[PDB]
Design a protein around this ligand. Structure first.
Ligand SMILES: [Zn+2]
Lengths: 320, 316
């Protein structure tokens, strides 16, 4: 059978400075799409998003956690990379959204156009920046069974995602998270802060739900034309409720269930279109080890986008 | 009034003589659709499918088991009724295919147009008739646990479908099925033969696979546009393999998993577009008893299709 293409889109936590710079400099489709969306975003943020992403004084290791810039930046990078692949004749059989990536998945699917989805992202960043306290998300490089056997180790935090057997993310207030990190160090449990400044996917961003739901009622969305698999439900969506784009950042995620659903009906090929290749790394942990060739990423801090795009050419579906 | 509409399509075993005769007589859209497809199928079979469906010398209780007529008849009835609903502005959010009903669901959703689906069905009946031995299908009105506790009662048969807690169907050779029936009656276990002359959904129609697969490779089908939930897979369906329309008649079915998948996302309303209301009865058993008014059938041997069409219009 022709193995279907899954386009995967990641969300908050996967961005980094200079993500996709080689595509921005050497690929006209990518650069044009980034500059087009930059004009829309500069009107609402007050300055170029692009110039912040590629600021020469900021390094990959400098956490790119400002919500006003990272929200638009993640969508712009992802949709621009979609445009590169579409222009080359590489089309998705499914799109998989994760966290803020649900927005890019929805735009690629046709639920809305890129300009309206970008606006919904800009609005959500501004509404959160005005009404919510700052917060943190922490990845635990260990077994999620720890949550059951030592629940007091993780007090004052909420579990938002289990990504594979040895990776899960929690979300909470800044001092609460920093105290958990102190406690985990004394237990020799390895962890890593995500480069974010809000406790996404937890109740600590609830102060923004009312204003965003108000905002979402002034919008009108189309039904998906490309099958969307959503990390919010772990399953494909065809009927979409009115608060979906809030739940995209508020509700916990079901990424493993999403991947299981796709591997249940066919042996898929997975392309990570989000920065860092976060979701391709998760998928590789969730499928048989010999099947790692079914999964690649494009935009990574190795800045090998052009070489990685040539790798993706082998995923092209046959004729006959 | 925001809970999604599911259009359901049954397959072999649900047909009966004089299906939807009141619609064929009184509904211009239904009649028009039936006669257009009858012309097409006549060029391939030789005679009229419709005149067989409404054979005046046949009663509802006479098994409509002639494959060359029953195959196209199920699709023609189901697609024609769909046209009646579309004409009334009642549109599906989902189509659900069961056995031969997957052809209708595929046609409604846009996988193929009605004429091409009808052609794939006719070729299937002809190939199966020309290559396969006859067989039988038996519904058992008792708990599927019987197959585990007393597997000796069902030897020489294949389980093809469990529909709810007190209904499953097996498939096998004519005499093998007749022996199972005799043994089930010594156990006071009630059963009922389906009106089919072939052991559908079992290995006994395998002699027809290579010819039908060869025929399929001369066809090109589109991506679904309307969401399809398939009893073949028990889940939503988006990318079909080459053998899908053969598996629609060859593989066991997972109707309960499909209904479970549909209720796991949202609370649906189910409209049975297949004859006899077979799928509607199954769903009533699979969802809470309070939710019986979420299931409607239309074409039943009571010949109340017009009254049922008024009922369903309160669904949208
Ligand atoms: Zn689906």
């Amino acid at each position: 059978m022709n193995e279907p293409l899954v386009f995967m889109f990641s969300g908050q936590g996967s961005q980094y400075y200079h993500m996709g710079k080689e595509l921005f400099k050497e690929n006209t489709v990518f650069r044009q799409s980034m500059l087009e969306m930059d004009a829309i975003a500069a009107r609402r943020i007050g300055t170029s998003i692009v110039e912040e992403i590629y600021h020469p004084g900021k390094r990959v290791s400098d956490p790119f956690d400002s919500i006003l810039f990272s929200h638009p930046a993640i969508f712009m990078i992802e949709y621009s990379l979609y445009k590169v692949l579409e222009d080359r004749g590489i089309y998705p059989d499914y799109v998989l959204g994760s966290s803020l990536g649900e927005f890019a998945a929805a735009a690629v699917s046709g639920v809305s156009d890129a300009e309206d989805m970008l606006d919904c992202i800009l609005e959500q960043a501004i509404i959160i920046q005005n009404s919510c306290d700052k917060g943190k998300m922490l990845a635990i490089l260990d077994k999620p069974q720890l949550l059951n056997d030592h629940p007091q180790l993780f007090g004052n935090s909420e579990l938002i995602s289990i990504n594979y057997d040895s990776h899960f993310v929690i979300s909470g207030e800044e001092d609460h998270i920093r105290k958990i990190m102190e406690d985990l160090k004394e237990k020799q449990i390895l962890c890593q802060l995500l480069p974010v400044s809000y406790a996404f996917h937890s109740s600590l961003i609830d102060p923004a739900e009312s204003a965003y739901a108000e905002f979402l009622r002034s919008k009108s969305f189309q039904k998906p034309s490309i099958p969307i698999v959503s990390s919010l439900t772990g399953s494909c969506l065809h009927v979409m409720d009115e608060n979906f784009f809030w739940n995209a950042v508020r509700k916990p995620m079901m990424f493993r269930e999403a991947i299981r659903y796709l591997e249940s009906q066919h042996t898929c090929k997975f392309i990570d279109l989000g920065p860092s290749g976060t979701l391709a790394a998760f998928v590789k942990q969730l499928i048989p080890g010999d099947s790692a060739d079914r999964c690649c990423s494009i935009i990574t801090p190795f800045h090998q986008e052009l070489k990685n795009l040539n790798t993706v050419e082998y995923f092209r579906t046959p004729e006959r």
